[PDB]
Design a protein around this ligand. Structure first.
Ligand SMILES: *[C@@H]1O[C@H](CO)[C@@H](O[C@@H]2O[C@H](CO)[C@@H](O[C@@H]3O[C@H](CO[C@@H]4O[C@H](CO[C@H]5O[C@H](CO)[C@@H](O)[C@H](O)[C@@H]5O)[C@@H](O)[C@H](O)[C@@H]4O)[C@@H](O)[C@H](O[C@@H]4O[C@H](CO)[C@@H](O)[C@H](O)[C@@H]4O)[C@@H]3O)[C@H](O)[C@H]2NC(C)=O)[C@H](O)[C@H]1NC(C)=O
Ligand SMILES: *[C@@H]1O[C@H](CO)[C@@H](O)[C@H](O)[C@H]1NC(C)=O
Lengths: 291, 145, 339, 388
């Protein structure tokens, strides 16, 4: 029998390397054999644990083997996963090998506001065609924005829960305090004045005028009550750079509602102003639902 | 929350639960993984319970079994949950595979009982009884010679 | 190899072959013999070839006497041998065997499709039809091959059943098929009489006019020009049919589709299925943008308030939705002052 | 092959070979003592004296040390090993632990071991050390070898999958994937985990990969385990063509180039070959003097008066055709002779299963048939088992 790192088959032999570590994205075929025998070593991305094997088993989702024939493949460390390709390639849209469309694996997409002040259901559309987690023939790729892996060898990236978010990295992160760093293992809460209600987001959303977010990591914005109002005119949502898929401009909303001043009152809930009430009525307290 | 079955956490203040190794299992939140009982097996690394080796098979350990192996050809295992303590033979335990009895035989590896040696037919109305030479054997010869 | 009939022959078809020889070291002429799997005819009388070069000789079997008609369906092994002398004990030098599949004539098989199959999305409009000219048939199995390009493989075998009641049409459904590339394809339907081996009873390929065309739904350009944006329920909204455009930006041979327009109001029905400006069921979808119709503009006044999705859709034969363009109109009677 | 890691218990195994092995009839094996100085200066706190036998014999005996006592990772160790009768290769293992990354020069010594006393240098020349290659310890990697971890319970969007069924695999996409077949594009705002059918030729039971079938097996698309080609036929996988561009749906991973599709991948062995096993991989040529049909789960022997050779000019040639060998398997299985031919006149053959013995260099030696001639006074007719 062949040793437990090699295989011998009648119909094929040799191995094909990973195309995601080359320039033109073409697997490079080599023929490495174990010295004491003739059996060929397993290709990168596969492994052979036992002795007599005709084919090399591909590694499962969450593991990787980046060298020729190996007895077993290791688990991807936290902060990295086993999606096919690299992160700068999973996110890219510009090809360099025209005959191959190589360095564009449109495997990352997201919905959001874009520069035609327009909402966009998935910014990267089309039929996904690079969706592979089993055969990982290189080092594990860093997580895409909005996803995290906290333990070794998770099969798939998990998405951040609605109240939290995960930026691209620390430098390009939106509202995120001084000491906090992002490495792909921790989803951070949304600051006060910001909310988030969707899964796997790279940025929080700004609370609109007439609403506030007093707590941290709110899945929904609180609505101002009669006798109060919030009017933050600089609050805005992040706009997604359609070329790099990274959102930039976020300004948080209000943390607490402003009570109506003396002589003014407000009766509707979601509003941005106070109305002075007419003749015959007065308001001698701040925050009156009806004078 | 407590660690789910198949996971454990021996430290305080952590945010993840580590997975149990082969031969061990764990129920809901537990500090450590408990070794499989004697005679039962667990091969994966997220096992929530240990399954017992079936009749005709034996566990390849006295405490933490990782694979149920078939009995050899000269042996038979009648009991479910048979294990192999390493003190005696390799394929022999208190409930593990036993040698076939002195005048019985078995040839298939995983068998739940040995079969008696058949008489040898030479012609009409004459049968030569057949015996076995050793204790654990897989073929019978005429008992006269 | 056979040239004969381009499609597989039947028991009522005569097969004509083509065979050439070439040697890279020798040049002396040899004598060739051709034998059919008929079982009744004998080996052809030994006849010489020309001088042998590296270039293969012309068709040695091109004469009119090298023909055969098979009386039974199945696989017939046609063999060709090379000797040196024309006498019986002459030494054999080479031999070549080729299979010829003769199909049944009493069984007619057709493959009918409902709508246009899009790209990688699944397609479930295919179904097959079998009609036997004779009485009860035994069990049958059918396979479908999506294209003849290399790397495209014949599917598994689907149990049809039996066809007992003479020349009645028996229909069977074909599992969902996925096409990897857009453009024209040559899908073939084959029918055998065994689950694993057996005889090739029939093959069917749609004619050049009915060939399958896989369409790419992201290449459909739709230009919808509904009238004014956010309005009131008293404001008339217009849909100009001479400015709205539909086109296919990949090729000029795509199948035609119908269009429909929805006002997103329950008071009015959506328009019936209609063709583009002047095309009919025998035309193709135009690559250059064309007006949807030459009629006058259509006006409508909404009966409620809110946000409405006035939409234009492209349907196919099976009433699938291939492409769709939505223009949003916000109706609201907000600012109205009465003194 | 030469350098260890840092702050990781590293085990040095030394293998000793003795030219005349200890006789199996020896009353006892031959004992040796291996002394190692790791080159570090942690535990003994001082490098030893000059490199001689007189100082290396002093190293403490740590043969039966455990991991608990302080001398387990001691830097100057002596371990006693024994060569059992019949053997002649032995090995001694030293545990070490290198706390820094500086260069190190370990030294090794072998001595003959008398009754609890270290003898002379085992290389029989004067004080010879075995200087290992100097090295610099690197940093220990922290990767874990094992299978995938099924994630614990987390909030997920409706449709996100973390486990697939049998015959399916987990993929990362934002399209719609029902029953393993894509039915719509962009059904989710963000990519989620979907279950996609395994391709024909592969099978799975965990749902995290599509494992191609081993040789001798085949399967259809959604199979959860491969099936074996029956006896007499071998499974030839069909050749795949890799996708032209990276904007095209792939079939499997980039390293998979042949797949064994449905039952059409079982091809019969040719004439003259046979294959008895129920999951067969190669066609075995018939044994010398035996013949077989196309199916050929077994062979039959040429009868008396007949010898096994090629029947090119006979009435019923039994050799395989070009279609059965070259158009089906390629150049792997060529055409071989499997006919039984009659003995000539005045020659007899009394045994079954005999073959014309071949000659590959036809100029010097010619091929010979094993047809015995009849003795004087006996004639025999043709293809006979005995003379008259
Ligand atoms: C960044 O991007 C964010 C993307 O989500 C975006 O969040 C969205 O913001 C919009 C507002 O711009 C949220 O709209 C929702 O509209 C509902 C109705 O709004 C008004 O309703 C009135 C109904 O009439 C009643 O009330 C009026 C007085 O208010 C009274 O006069 C009548 O008599 C009636 O009694 C109507 O007249 C007005 O015309 C408006 O249409 C609100 O009720 C919503 O409140 C929400 O309720 C949701 C229930 O699930 C809850 O999920 C929300 O958290 C919230 O409590 C809300 O105002 C939209 O919901 C929101 N998206 C989500 C999913 O939260 C941000 O606005 C954007 N940020 C910035 C700064 O641009
Ligand atoms: C996916 O497709 C099925 C059937 O076409 C449909 O019922 C289901 O709602 C779709 N899922 C999503 C997320 O749109």
């Amino acid at each position: 029998k062949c040793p437990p790192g090699t295989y011998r088959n009648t119909w094929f032999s040799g191995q094909l390397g990973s195309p995601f570590i080359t320039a033109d994205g073409v697997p490079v075929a080599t023929t490495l054999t174990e010295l004491g025998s003739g059996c060929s070593q397993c290709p990168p991305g596969t492994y052979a644990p036992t002795f007599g094997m005709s084919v090399c088993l591909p590694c499962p989702a969450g593991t990787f083997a980046s060298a020729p024939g190996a007895t077993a493949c290791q688990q991807c460390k936290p902060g990295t996963n086993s999606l096919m390709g690299d992160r700068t390639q999973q996110m890219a849209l510009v090809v360099t090998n025209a005959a191959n469309d190589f360095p564009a694996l449109r495997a990352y997409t997201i919905s959001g506001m874009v520069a035609g002040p327009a909402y966009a259901k998935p910014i990267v559309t089309g039929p996904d065609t690079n969706f592979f987690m089993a055969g990982k023939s290189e080092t594990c790729s860093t997580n895409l924005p909005g996803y995290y892996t906290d333990v070794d060898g998770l099969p798939i990236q998990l998405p951040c829960k609605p109240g939290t978010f995960m930026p691209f990295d620390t430098a390009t992160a939106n509202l995120l305090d001084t000491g906090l760093t992002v490495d792909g293992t921790q989803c951070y809460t949304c600051q006060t004045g910001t909310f988030n209600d969707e899964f796997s987001q790279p940025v929080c959303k700004a609370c609109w005028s007439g609403s506030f977010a007093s707590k941290r990591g709110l899945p929904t914005c609180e609505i101002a009550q009669p006798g109060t109002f919030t009017n933050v005119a600089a609050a805005a949502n992040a706009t997604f750079n359609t070329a790099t898929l990274i959102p930039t401009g976020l300004v948080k909303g209000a943390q607490a509602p402003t009570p109506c001043g003396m002589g003014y009152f407000q009766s509707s809930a979601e509003t941005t102003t106070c109305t002075a009430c007419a003749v015959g009525t007065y308001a001698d307290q701040a925050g009156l639902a009806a004078c | 929350k407590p660690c789910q079955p198949g996971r454990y956490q021996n430290s305080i203040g952590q945010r993840v639960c580590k997975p149990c190794d082969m031969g061990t299992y764990s129920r809901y939140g537990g500090e450590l993984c408990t070794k499989c009982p004697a005679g039962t097996v667990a091969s994966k690394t997220g096992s929530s319970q240990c399954t017992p080796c079936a009749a005709g098979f034996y566990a390849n350990a006295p405490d933490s079994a990782t694979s149920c192996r078939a009995c050899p050809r000269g042996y038979y295992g009648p009991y479910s949950g048979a294990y192999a303590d390493n003190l005696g033979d390799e394929f022999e335990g208190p409930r593990g595979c036993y040698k076939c009895p002195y005048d019985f035989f078995a040839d298939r590896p995983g068998v739940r009982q040995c079969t008696a040696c058949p008489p040898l037919d030479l012609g009409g109305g004459n049968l030569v009884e057949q015996c076995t030479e050793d204790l654990g054997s897989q073929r019978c010869k005429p008992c006269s010679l | 190899d056979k040239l004969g009939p381009t499609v597989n022959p039947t028991t009522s078809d005569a097969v004509t072959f083509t065979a050439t020889v070439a040697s890279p070291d020798s040049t002396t002429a040899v004598f060739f013999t051709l034998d059919y799997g008929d079982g009744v005819t004998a080996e052809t009388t030994r006849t010489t070839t020309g001088a042998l070069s590296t270039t293969p000789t012309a068709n040695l079997v091109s004469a009119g006497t090298y023909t055969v008609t098979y009386a039974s369906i199945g696989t017939k092994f046609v063999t060709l041998r090379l000797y040196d002398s024309a006498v019986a004990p002459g030494v054999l030098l080479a031999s070549k065997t080729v299979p010829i599949y003769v199909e049944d004539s009493t069984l007619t098989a057709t493959l009918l499709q409902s709508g246009v199959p899009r790209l990688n999305l699944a397609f479930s409009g295919f179904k097959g039809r079998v009609s036997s000219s004779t009485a009860n048939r035994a069990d049958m199995w059918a396979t479908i091959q999506l294209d003849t390009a290399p790397g495209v493989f014949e599917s598994s075998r689907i149990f049809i059943g039996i066809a007992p009641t003479a020349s009645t049409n028996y229909d069977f459904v074909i599992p969902d098929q996925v096409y990897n590339l857009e453009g024209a394809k040559t899908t073939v339907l084959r029918i055998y009489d065994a689950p694993v081996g057996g005889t090739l009873l029939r093959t069917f390929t749609p004619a050049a006019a009915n060939a399958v065309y896989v369409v790419d739904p992201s290449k459909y350009v739709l230009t919808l020009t509904v009238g004014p944006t956010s309005v009131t329920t008293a404001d008339q909204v217009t849909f100009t049919q001479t400015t709205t455009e539909v086109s296919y930006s990949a090729s000029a041979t795509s199948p035609i589709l119908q269009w429909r327009f929805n006002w997103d109001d329950p008071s009015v029905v959506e328009t019936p299925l209609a063709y583009p400006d002047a095309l009919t069921a025998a035309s193709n979808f135009p690559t250059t943008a064309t007006a949807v119709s030459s009629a006058a503009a259509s006006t409508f006044r909404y009966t409620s308030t809110g946000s409405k999705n006035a939409r234009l859709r492209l349907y196919d034969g099976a009433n699938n939705v291939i492409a769709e363009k939505i223009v949003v109109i916000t109706v609201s009677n907000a600012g109205y002052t009465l003194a | 092959p030469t350098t260890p890691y840092t702050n990781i218990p590293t085990y040095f195994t030394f293998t000793l070979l003795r030219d005349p092995p200890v006789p199996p009839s020896a009353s006892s094996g031959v004992q040796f003592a291996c002394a190692l100085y790791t080159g570090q200066n942690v535990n003994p706190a001082s490098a030893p004296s000059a490199i001689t036998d007189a100082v290396y014999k002093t190293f403490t005996d740590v043969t039966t040390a455990v991991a608990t006592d302080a001398n387990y990772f001691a830097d100057q160790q002596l371990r006693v090993v024994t060569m059992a009768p019949g053997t002649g290769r032995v090995s001694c293992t030293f545990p070490t632990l290198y706390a820094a990354a500086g260069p190190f020069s370990p030294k090794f010594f072998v001595f003959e071991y008398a009754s609890s006393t270290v003898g002379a240098n085992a290389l029989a020349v004067a004080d010879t050390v075995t200087s290992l290659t100097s090295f610099t310890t690197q940093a220990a990697p922290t990767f874990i070898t094992g299978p995938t971890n099924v994630p614990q319970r987390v909030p997920l969007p409706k449709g996100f999958r973390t486990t697939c069924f049998d015959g399916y695999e987990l993929i990362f996409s934002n399209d719609n994937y029902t029953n393993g077949v894509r039915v719509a594009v962009d059904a989710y705002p963000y990519p989620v985990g979907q279950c996609r059918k395994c391709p024909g030729g592969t099978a799975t039971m965990d749902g995290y990969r599509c494992i191609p079938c081993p040789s001798g097996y085949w399967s259809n698309e959604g199979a959860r385990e491969c099936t074996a080609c029956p006896a007499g036929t071998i499974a030839k996988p069909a050749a795949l063509t890799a996708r032209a561009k990276y904007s095209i749906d792939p079939t499997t991973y980039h390293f998979v180039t042949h797949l064994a599709m449905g039952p059409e991948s079982c091809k019969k062995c040719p004439k003259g070959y046979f294959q008895p096993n129920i999951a067969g991989t190669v066609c075995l040529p018939c044994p010398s003097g035996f013949v077989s049909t196309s199916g050929a789960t077994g062979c039959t022997a040429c009868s008396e008066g007949t010898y096994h050779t090629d029947g090119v000019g006979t009435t019923t040639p039994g050799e395989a055709t070009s279609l059965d060998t070259t158009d089906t398997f390629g150049s792997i299985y060529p055409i071989i002779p499997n006919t039984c031919r009659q003995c000539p006149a005045n020659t007899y053959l009394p045994l079954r299963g005999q073959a014309a013995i071949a000659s590959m260099n036809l100029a010097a030696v010619s091929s010979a048939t094993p047809c015995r001639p009849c003795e004087d006074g006996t004639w025999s007719k043709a293809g006979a088992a005995g003379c008259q």
